[PDB]
Design a protein around this ligand. Structure first.
Ligand SMILES: Nc1ncnc2c1ncn2[C@@H]1O[C@H](COP(=O)(O)OP(=O)(O)OP(=O)(O)O)[C@@H](O)[C@H]1O
Ligand SMILES: [Mg+2]
Ligand SMILES: [Mg+2]
Lengths: 20, 336
């Protein structure tokens, strides 16, 4: 499921803004 | 509303033109615990000695700000935060700097980040998500009328107060602009396609971000996700969006209008502007005046045990606040 794929992903934690 | 907005703009301009500075100092507070961190600073729960009140202090290392090229952005951050006034925006209580750091002392919003609750519970029911969304909608209306672009909407930058309402924080990328701008900034999952394509953009990126927020709140996961930002961008640019089976027809319709690549069709950026969103079927049960007045029934009210309780926040490794005997980047931050 889409859920299972998100939960197994590496971006489920707090996401910080982009910095160069 | 156009009556209210006009007065608000007069109030904002006086402050934008003559910003307040140096309204406190470091030794007037007792640093207690870090509430959260980002790419740029750290926010600690602090207590003001003379009054006994708690506040949330954002600390920016001047040398780090320079290295990451956020000098102008930080000046924007403080200059704007001290001038705005709206029921759903966090208040800047005091601000100041020293040899090493820059400080923004905000009102402490004890309910925790929306992010934490959202991931714990999994997702929000439509009426629940709608309650938060209406608030964001009225906030972008206020901000946009002042010629301001927010640029960093995400659950991590949203906090729940004692009444169960939203308080927007982190004006890091907020900028006052008439026309277009080109800075590639924000958070990968929430970037609009114009940003990624380096074509120059406007306020409409905020409305695309709202579409992303509503989707994440009601689904529990974002519309475009992957392991690396580059993969994420490919998905955003393609534009293909897939909705969970529980999404109501009304919600899906609104989202196709917000997550709209064609900026000449995206809700919020049309003739009727914000009214296309307010009058949408998904928002029919919404009493726009009642919400602004905080008279509406909050779906979830965070539990808080006394002043200074940080139970609604994650724990963070503490780091000693250093202050050199030598002033750093003095000229660069003169106006701060
Ligand atoms: N007024 C407040 N009350 C309570 N907590 C707050 C407040 N303001 C910020 N925080 C907490 O501190 C965290 C980081 O603050 P902020 O978003 O300003 O940092 P940043 O480094 O600028 O973020 P980013 O990495 O997205 O650029 C927030 O995500 C939140 O958890
Ligand atoms: Mg942040
Ligand atoms: Mg930030």
């Amino acid at each position: 499921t889409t859920y299972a794929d998100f939960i197994a992903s590496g971006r489920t934690g707090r996401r910080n803004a982009i910095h160069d | 509303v156009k009556e209210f907005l006009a007065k608000a703009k007069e109030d904002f301009l006086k402050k934008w033109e003559t910003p307040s500075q140096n309204t406190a100092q470091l030794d007037q507070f007792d640093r207690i615990k870090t509430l959260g961190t980002g790419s740029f600073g750290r926010v600690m729960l602090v207590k003001h000695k003379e009054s006994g009140n708690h506040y949330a202090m954002k600390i920016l290392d001047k040398q780090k700000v320079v290295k990451l090229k956020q000098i102008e952005h930080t000046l924007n951050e403080k200059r704007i935060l001290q001038a705005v006034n709206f029921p759903f925006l966090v208040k800047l209580e005091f601000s100041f700097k020293d040899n090493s750091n820059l400080y923004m002392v905000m009102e402490y919003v004890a309910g925790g980040e929306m992010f934490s609750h959202l991931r714990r519970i999994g997702r929000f029911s439509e009426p629940h998500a709608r309650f938060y969304a209406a608030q964001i909608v009225l906030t972008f209306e206020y901000l946009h009328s002042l010629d301001l672009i927010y640029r960093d909407l995400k659950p991590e930058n949203l906090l729940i107060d004692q009444q169960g309402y939203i308080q927007v924080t982190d004006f890091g990328f907020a900028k006052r602009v008439k026309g277009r701008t080109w800075t590639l900034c924000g958070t990968p999952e929430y970037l609009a396609p114009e940003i990624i394509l380096s074509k120059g953009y406007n306020k409409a990126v905020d409305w695309w971000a709202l579409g992303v927020l509503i989707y994440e709140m009601a689904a529990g996961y974002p519309p475009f996700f992957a392991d690396q930002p580059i993969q994420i961008y490919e998905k955003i640019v393609s534009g293909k969006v897939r909705f969970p089976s529980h999404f109501s027809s009304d919600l899906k319709d609104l989202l196709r209008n917000l997550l709209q690549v064609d900026l000449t069709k995206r809700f919020g950026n049309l003739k009727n502007g914000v009214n296309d969103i307010k009058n949408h079927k998904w928002f029919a049960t919404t009493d726009w005046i009642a919400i602004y007045q905080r008279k509406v029934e909050a779906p979830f009210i965070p539990k808080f045990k006394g002043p200074g309780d940080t139970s609604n926040f994650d724990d963070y490794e503490e780091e000693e606040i250093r202050v050199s005997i030598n002033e750093k980047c003095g000229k660069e931050f003169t106006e701060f």
